[PDB]
Amino acid sequence: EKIICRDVARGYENVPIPCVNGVDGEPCPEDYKYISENCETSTMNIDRNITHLQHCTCVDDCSSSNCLCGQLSIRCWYDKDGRLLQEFNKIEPPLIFECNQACSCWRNCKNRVVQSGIKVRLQLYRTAKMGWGVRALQTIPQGTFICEYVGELISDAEADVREDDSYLFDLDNEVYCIDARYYGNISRFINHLCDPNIIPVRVFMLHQDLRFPRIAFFSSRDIRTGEELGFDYGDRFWDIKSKYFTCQCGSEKCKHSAEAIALEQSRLA
Numbered sequence: 001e002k003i004i005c006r007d008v009a010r011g012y013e014n015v016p017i018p019c020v021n022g023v024d025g026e027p028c029p030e031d032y033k034y035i036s037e038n039c040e041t042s043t044m045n046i047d048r049n050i051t052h053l054q055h056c057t058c059v060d061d062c063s064s065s066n067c068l069c070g071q072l073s074i075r076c077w078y079d080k081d082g083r084l085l086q087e088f089n090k091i092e093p094p095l096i097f098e099c100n101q102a103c104s105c106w107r108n109c110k111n112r113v114v115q116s117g118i119k120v121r122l123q124l125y126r127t128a129k130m131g132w133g134v135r136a137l138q139t140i141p142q143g144t145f146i147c148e149y150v151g152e153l154i155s156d157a158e159a160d161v162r163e164d165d166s167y168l169f170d171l172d173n174e175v176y177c178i179d180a181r182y183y184g185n186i187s188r189f190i191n192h193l194c195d196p197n198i199i200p201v202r203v204f205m206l207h208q209d210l211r212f213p214r215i216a217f218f219s220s221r222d223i224r225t226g227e228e229l230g231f232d233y234g235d236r237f238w239d240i241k242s243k244y245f246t247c248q249c250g251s252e253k254c255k256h257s258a259e260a261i262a263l264e265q266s267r268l269a
């Protein structure tokens, strides 16, 4: 309905991300700090040694199969328009290694999609049943980079004592987490869908410290204007939270609704 905030990102993204609410009286969320890149709250010592970067020697646009950075990702998974290859493994995505400051290529090469930031028009809006959510203000073709899951990098030991685990993304590999509860970007508002339309992909850009992949959401199908974005939060989230609330995604594939939980519980016998 009417726009309550012109840009929740305070100008830190390539495009503004407005907030609207046509459902209830809740004002624009303001109990967190918007950040556009991951932050640290303890000593993490991400390995930023430029000599530890694997890098390419391309003098073209890194569209050839001899791009070392593409080879690290098995092959460069970006097409000429920056979208994931149509054979990209969406079920089990590979690690993507983008070009970096040690590569001989130019900053506009074809292997720098995620580091170039948000390009699609997104909107923070009030959903009917799931609080705030994020939807597209444009058609988004399948394979398009949407946004990064940005927040506070924390150790697994720190995550184990975090009281609010509603905004946690496990990185896995000596395992770390992104906590977007107190510091986060637009992705902290993306809800869970049992029939998701975006997938998280682990990406390396300016560093290649394998403890800290950056989490990039790409569309898993064509997305229509106005459609809510959502990914599969996974079973660790729902094993913990189903006791407190159930899924409202409304899909016929929904496996975390009260009915879905009760039906598997009845089948139990």
Ligand SMILES: COc1cc2nc(N(C)C3CCCC3)nc(NC3CCN(C)CC3)c2cc1OC
Binding pocket: 155, 156, 157, 159, 160, 161, 162, 163, 165, 166, 168, 169, 170, 175, 176, 177, 233, 234, 236, 237, 238, 240, 241
């Ligand atoms: C994706 O979603 C989640 C991920 C969660 N991940 C963790 N850890 C500890 C990571 C650390 C590395 C591997 C496992 N903990 C959670 N919760 C713990 C439960 C016990 N309390 C006292 C502390 C918080 C999580 C909850 C999630 O969603 C509800």
Ligand SMILES: C[S@@+](CC[C@H](N)C(=O)[O-])C[C@H]1O[C@@H](n2cnc3c(N)ncnc32)[C@H](O)[C@@H]1O
Binding pocket: 129, 130, 131, 132, 133, 166, 167, 188, 189, 190, 191, 192, 193, 241, 245, 246, 247, 248, 249
């Ligand atoms: C990362 S947040 C998403 C943004 C949240 N809706 C908000 O208003 O800030 C996760 C929380 O959103 C709600 N949520 C997300 N997906 C949901 C779903 N499929 N069904 C019910 N609640 C959901 C739950 O409260 C969940 O703990």
Ligand SMILES: [Zn+2]
Binding pocket: 056, 057, 058, 061, 062, 066, 067, 068, 069, 070, 099, 103, 105
């Ligand atoms: Zn290259």
Ligand SMILES: [Zn+2]
Binding pocket: 055, 056, 057, 062, 067, 068, 069, 098, 099, 100, 103, 104, 105, 111
């Ligand atoms: Zn390169």
Ligand SMILES: [Zn+2]
Binding pocket: 056, 058, 061, 062, 099, 100, 103, 105, 106, 109, 110, 111
């Ligand atoms: Zn390059």
Ligand SMILES: [Zn+2]
Binding pocket: 193, 194, 247, 248, 249, 250, 251, 253, 254, 255, 256, 257
């Ligand atoms: Zn569901």
